[PDB]
Structures are given as C-alpha cells and as structure tokens.
C-alpha cells in the first residue's frame, strides 16, 4: 500500500444495515469535506485499489480534504442491486448506493464530523459512471464528480453486454441481478449519458478523463477487450459532445492522446484535479 507510515490512515468497520454486513473503509481525516475514491471492477476486500496502486492518501494529505476509500464491492458498480447476484452464491444484495449516500456518510458525520454534503465522488473504469450517477442523483452530497475511463452510456448498444461480460469475469457477478435485463429502466436510470440533464441542471462540476490504447488496466489483449477499450473512448467523446449539446458548462474534459487506462495516469488525473476540487469544495 502507498499509505506508508506518517499518513493518519484509519481502517474503519462501518455497518451497512441494507447489506447486513460491516463495510471496511480506509479513511484519512483532513477536513469536513471529503473525496470519495471509488474502486475499479475488481475491487478487493482488503484494500481499495487507489491505496494499492497510488499515493492518493499522501497526495491529498493536508489538502484540506478528507479522503474516503470504501473497501470491497467487486463488480458492484456501486449501485443498489435488485437481488443477490444469481450465479456466484452471493448471499445478500449489494446496496452500495444506499451505503455511499446514507449509511457511510451518516457514520462519518456522527463519528468524525465529516459533512454528508459538499463532497466529491471520484471513480475510474467501473466506478467512473458510478461517480457521475452519484452526483446526478445526490447533487447536495456530490457537487463534484470525476470519471476516469468510465463507461458513460451503460444502457446503449453493446454496453449492457460488455458490462455483463466484465462483471462475470470479475467474481462471476450477474449484471441481470444488478439492473435486470437491458430493457429494464434501471439501465437508463444509471446511465450517465441519459442522466446528463441532471448533471447540467445541478451544475455539477465534472472532471472527465479517458485514455486510449491496449492493453491496459482496463483490459486490452483480444478483440473483445480491444473493442471495449475503443468503445470506452468513443462513448466518453460522445458524452462530452452530449453534455455540451445539453447545455453543460462546468466540465473539464481530458482526452490526452498519450493518456492510458492505467493507475499511473488515473493517479495523475487525481492529482491534477486536486486544485479543482479544493476550489469547488472549499473555495
């Protein structure tokens, strides 16, 4: 982990009444407002990917912002599922939106003094869209959201299938148990592209990054993974175009040709957005 000695990183056990279990949370206090760092598709139950692969905590130490790294939620898309993943034996239903928007913030407010409002949600790949959705539906809690190499049009064309494939490949989770068949409204409800009107209306400050190239931490190798990576960039470009078309004016769109879908670049983006977050959240 990059949470080396000196950094006041705590490991909290936060009860989730909705999921009937305790959720581990890596936390670094540094102010009433916090940056929620969401993990990727293969989120582990011991440490958040951000701490494993980047010096995120150190980079935000003394930034005037607390850093919250929830642990776990493999292939959960940080959303509330319809039912336990049907196939891999999950014995409970993922309710990560409920955890992130109600249970965890309530806990941190009562015990740490972290404000449940005026925070930033930052996600990458799997959680890229999650961050924008959290901000779309919970503007008070998240006036700021960043998506790094996110899947921003999950309900469109190949996306439901690609997402289902990724989830199955990551812990054997079932996308159908999450948002039902692709025709289910849950897919559009959790589609950043479809929810752009919300982001515009709430004047959400959005930071959207997308690299390009394969292989990467996004995947790569074979033709299917290559298609996914290519679709990811194109969809991010369409998201930017649609956001603009819909009246959006508070976004930062970073599409550097040499940017990659990797922790080094996602970390670079996290650092680059620090000043932006500080100004928006503590300005």
């Amino acid at each position: 982990m990059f949470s080396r000695p000196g950094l006041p990183v705590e490991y909290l056990q936060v009860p989730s009444a909705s999921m009937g279990r305790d959720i581990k949370v890596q936390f670094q206090g540094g102010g009433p407002h916090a940056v929620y760092l969401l993990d990727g598709l293969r989120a582990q139950d011991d440490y958040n990917g951000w701490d494993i692969n980047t010096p995120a905590f150190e980079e935000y130490y003394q930034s005037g912002l607390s850093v919250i790294m929830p642990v776990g939620g493999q292939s959960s898309f940080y959303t509330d599922w319809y039912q336990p993943s049907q196939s891999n034996g999950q014995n409970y239903t993922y309710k990560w939106e409920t955890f992130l928007t109600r249970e965890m913030p309530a806990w941190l407010q009562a015990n740490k003094g972290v404000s449940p409002t005026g925070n930033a949600a930052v996600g990458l790949s799997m959680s890229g869209g999650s961050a924008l959705i959290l901000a779309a539906y919970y503007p008070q809690q998240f006036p700021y959201a960043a998506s790094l190499s996110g899947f921003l049009n999950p309900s469109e064309s190949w996306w439901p299938t690609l997402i289902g494939l990724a989830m199955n490949d990551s812990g054997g989770y079932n996308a159908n148990s999450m948002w039902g068949p692709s025709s289910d409204p849950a897919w559009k409800r959790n589609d950043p592209m479809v929810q752009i009107p919300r982001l515009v209306a709430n004047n959400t400050r959005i930071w959207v990054y997308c690299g390009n190239g394969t292989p990467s931490d996004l995947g790569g190798d074979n033709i299917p993974a290559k298609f996914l990576e290519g679709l990811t960039l194109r969809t991010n470009q369409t998201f930017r175009d649609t956001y603009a078309a819909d009246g959006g004016r508070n976004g930062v769109f970073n599409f550097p040709p040499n940017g990659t879908h990797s922790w080094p670049y996602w970390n670079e983006q996290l650092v680059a957005m620090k000043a932006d977050i500080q100004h928006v959240l503590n300005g």
Side-chain angles (χ1 to χ4, degrees):
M1 312 305 102
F2 284 77
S3 177
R4 65 192 179 82
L7 295 178
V9 177
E10 311 189 337
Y11 293 84
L12 313 169
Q13 296 294 156
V14 183
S16 172
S18 65
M19 292 188 262
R21 56 171 40 50
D22 296 330
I23 305 302
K24 180 177 180 180
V25 176
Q26 290 183 272
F27 180 81
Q28 184 181 79
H33 300 305
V35 178
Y36 285 48
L37 292 176
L38 307 181
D39 214 337
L41 187 77
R42 304 179 191 288
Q44 286 171 29
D45 289 332
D46 52 352
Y47 303 105
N48 181 297
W50 282 100
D51 197 28
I52 297 176
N53 303 286
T54 80
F57 279 132
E58 184 183 5
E59 286 160 346
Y60 277 67
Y61 179 60
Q62 298 183 305
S63 61
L65 299 162
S66 288
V67 179
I68 302 167
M69 284 191 202
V71 181
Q74 183 180 200
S75 299
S76 73
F77 273 81
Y78 293 106
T79 192
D80 276 11
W81 287 44
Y82 276 127
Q83 54 172 172
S85 187
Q86 301 310 316
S87 174
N88 64 5
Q90 183 177 44
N91 61 190
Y92 70 99
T93 305
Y94 270 151
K95 295 299 182 178
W96 276 88
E97 173 166 319
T98 292
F99 179 70
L100 297 176
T101 65
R102 299 187 277 292
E103 310 174 329
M104 188 184 73
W107 197 99
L108 292 169
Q109 172 178 48
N111 301 297
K112 299 295 192 177
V114 181
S115 179
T117 59
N119 301 294
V122 179
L124 67 307
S125 185
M126 172 188 79
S127 59
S130 306
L132 295 178
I133 290 303
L134 287 174
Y137 292 89
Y138 305 84
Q140 258 77 293
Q141 176 177 23
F142 304 112
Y144 194 111
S147 171
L148 313 179
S149 298
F151 313 133
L152 310 187
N153 201 6
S155 68
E156 190 54 41
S157 306
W158 274 97
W159 285 114
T161 297
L162 295 174
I163 287 172
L165 284 169
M167 292 173 61
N168 180 66
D169 187 69
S170 180
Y173 286 82
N174 193 163
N176 293 304
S177 297
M178 182 172 77
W179 297 330
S182 63
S183 61
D184 191 284
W187 283 87
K188 291 178 176 295
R189 186 277 186 179
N190 296 291
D191 187 312
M193 190 78 72
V194 177
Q195 300 311 317
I196 277 172
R198 288 177 180 275
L199 297 173
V200 175
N202 300 310
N203 191 43
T204 304
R205 175 65 173 176
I206 66 177
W207 180 287
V208 174
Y209 163 88
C210 193
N212 61 281
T214 56
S216 64
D217 291 318
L218 197 75
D221 53 77
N222 55 51
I223 293 182
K226 279 191 177 184
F227 178 68
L228 171 57
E229 187 284 334
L231 191 63
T232 297
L233 175 59
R234 293 197 295 285
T235 292
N236 263 284
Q237 293 169 309
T238 298
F239 180 88
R240 172 197 56 196
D241 290 351
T242 307
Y243 177 69
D246 291 358
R249 310 184 65 182
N250 203 23
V252 173
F253 289 92
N254 296 163
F255 298 140
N258 299 323
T260 60
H261 302 296
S262 64
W263 289 104
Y265 231 100
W266 291 325
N267 174 246
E268 182 282 319
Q269 285 293 297
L270 180 63
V271 174
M273 71 175 72
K274 186 171 63 178
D276 204 60
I277 292 178
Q278 292 173 307
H279 284 277
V280 175
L281 301 191
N282 302 317

